[PDB]
């Protein structure tokens, strides 16, 4: 042992089937070569230390180091590189997304030699993913529980999010649900607040769920937000939803956090509740191309920690490259086996070994004229959210819901007959306007 101040760059390392793999987009400081930057990413997210310590001689630290095993340049960027890092399975606490994030992204983003750093993807090996419950139910079970097949599901976030009494809030829910939406939704911000306390909201929303279900003959739900300041409060709210017998609750998984989210996913599994996940605050982390974590990493983490729905953004008003990235992480959320595909931002082949998928939820200023594109791009296993697109209908919530349900079913019918939604979508909608006055009224407010 001697005290005192590219070991982590191993380009010929063969990844193990038990390794957790990471793809980092790294921007070195001026004068830092890409190999030294990749080595630093691996060292500073594993066993790197600034001075030698005698305790290393009590173990075999090569068994615990992260290894940067490949570096590639990024096209169009003179100073960005993708550095691939392998982490041994033994670093990670079983079943803990919290520890997975801590271990991989806990420290390295602050290293001085890295001007910017973004985690783009993780390869979750089956040996590690089998230590997680995953979604409380997942896509196929949810469809069977709710008796819903053959079309995207439809939801609406109640607006204004704050300002309504609990009873007026529930009235809006009932009118949306009775017109043909499957779900209404608490805003991510709606938890418990002055003038709308959570238990009052739960009571009136439950009344609305059951009134609309009895009226329509279709099973209805409302994403009752259980997000709370403490774990005890969060579970208290899920417990009352359980008592009310309603089908679905909601969590803001990033602002509540993964430790609370995993607890709630366990409670939902144990009690038959579906779990709607909102990704509030994700753009603090995932927006900039040069620094943070891509949403697909946050999406894989939610599938592991547990949720039955997850918000996934929109594809309309987006360029082809952005839509391709969305479709990539939609497959990572829904499918059992996803082959590597860099054109869709899938940096690693991902095998979920029968962990159920999560329903992606599309949202963001969408209305009836977006129904062909949304149906074509997401397919059946999606929830399409129409907030202003329902409450903004000139005849009110039930006709607005009906216009959205008619538009969607018109698209589904035409698709099933073999028609091309990408080219015939506007005509399919116009044709339905001829017999649906609700859809015709929506189509004059908002434009193709």
């Amino acid at each position: 042992f001697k005290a005192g101040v590219l070991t982590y760059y191993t380009p010929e390392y063969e990844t193990k089937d038990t390794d957790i793999l990471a793809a980092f987009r790294v921007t070195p400081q001026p004068g830092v070569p890409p190999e030294e930057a990749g080595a630093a990413v691996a060292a500073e997210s594993s066993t790197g230390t600034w001075t030698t310590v005698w305790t290393d001689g009590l173990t075999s630290l090569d068994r615990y180091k992260g290894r940067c095993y490949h570096i590639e340049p990024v096209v169009g960027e003179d100073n960005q590189y993708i550095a691939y890092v392998a982490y041994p399975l033994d670093l990670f606490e079983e079943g803990s997304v919290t520890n997975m994030f801590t271990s991989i992204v806990g420290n390295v983003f602050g290293f001085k030699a890295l001007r910017a750093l973004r985690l783009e993807d993780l390869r979750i090996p089956p040996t590690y993913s089998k230590t997680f419950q995953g979604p409380p139910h997942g896509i196929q079970v949810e469809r069977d529980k709710l008796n819903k097949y053959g079309r995207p599901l439809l939801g609406c976030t109640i607006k204004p999010k704050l300002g309504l009494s609990a009873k007026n809030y529930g009235r809006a829910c009932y009118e949306c649900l009775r017109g043909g939406l499957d779900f209404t939704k608490d805003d991510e911000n709606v938890n418990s607040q002055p003038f709308m306390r959570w238990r009052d909201r739960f009571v009136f929303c439950a009344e609305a769920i059951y009134k609309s279900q009895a009226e329509t003959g279709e099973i209805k739900g409302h994403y009752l937000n259980a997000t709370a300041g403490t774990c005890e409060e969060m579970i208290k709210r899920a417990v009352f939803a359980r008592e009310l017998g309603v089908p679905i609750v909601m969590h803001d998984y990033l602002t509540g956090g993964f430790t609370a989210n995993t607890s709630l996913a366990h409670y939902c599994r144990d009690n038959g509740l579906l779990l709607h996940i909102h990704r509030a605050m994700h753009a603090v982390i995932d927006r900039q191309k040069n620094h943070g974590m891509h949403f697909r990493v946050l999406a894989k983490a939610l599938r592991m920690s547990g949720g039955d729905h997850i918000h996934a953004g929109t594809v309309v008003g987006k360029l082809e490259g952005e839509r391709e990235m969305t479709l990539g992480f939609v497959d990572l959320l829904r499918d059992d086996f996803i082959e590597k595909d860099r054109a869709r931002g899938i940096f690693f082949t991902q095998d979920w070994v029968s962990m159920p998928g999560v329903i992606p939820v599309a949202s963001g200023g969408i209305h009836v004229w977006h129904m062909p594109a949304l149906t074509e791009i997401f397919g059946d296993d999606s929830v399409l959210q129409f907030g202003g697109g329902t409450l903004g209908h000139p005849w009110g919530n039930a006709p607005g819901a009906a216009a959205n349900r008619v538009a969607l079913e018109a698209c589904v019918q035409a698709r099933n007959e073999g028609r091309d939604l990408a080219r015939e979508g506007n005509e399919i909608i116009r044709s339905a306007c001829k017999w649906s006055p609700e859809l015709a009224a929506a189509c004059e407010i908002w434009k193709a």
Partner: protein, 119 residues
């Protein structure tokens, strides 16, 4: 402004907000199953809707199953054979709703359900 009907407008999930399917339109929906190698299956019930008699625990409902008409139509090559069985089911149970299910043996799940006859 028209008011969305509050009575006499009960629904049956996918396609039930559309006008009633013509025979040709129904055959097109069945052909969609066949093109996708999904197995059509008819089921019927005089009670059209879910209820909650035995439990109100989350995501428990009664009335999600109806009664199977014969068996899923494995090896069906001709959508008119599903329409034929539809007419048999109506003749035996003219006061029952009848709907067409689809089964996906690769996803290993039921994947389609749409109304085909109302009394």
């Amino acid at each position: 402004m028209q008011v969305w009907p509050a009575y006499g407008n009960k629904k049956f999930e996918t396609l039930s907000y559309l006008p009633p399917l013509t025979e040709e339109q129904l055959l097109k929906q069945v052909d969609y199953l066949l093109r996708n190698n999904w197995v059509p299956c008819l089921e019927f019930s005089k009670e059209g809707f879910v209820y909650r008699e035995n439990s109100t625990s989350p995501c428990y409902y009664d009335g999600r199953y109806w009664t199977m008409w014969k068996l899923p139509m494995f090896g069906c090559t001709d959508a008119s054979q599903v329409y034929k069985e539809l007419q048999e089911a109506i003749a035996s149970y003219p006061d029952a709703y009848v709907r067409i299910l689809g089964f996906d043996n690769i996803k290993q799940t039921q994947c389609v359900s749409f109304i085909a006859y109302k009394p």
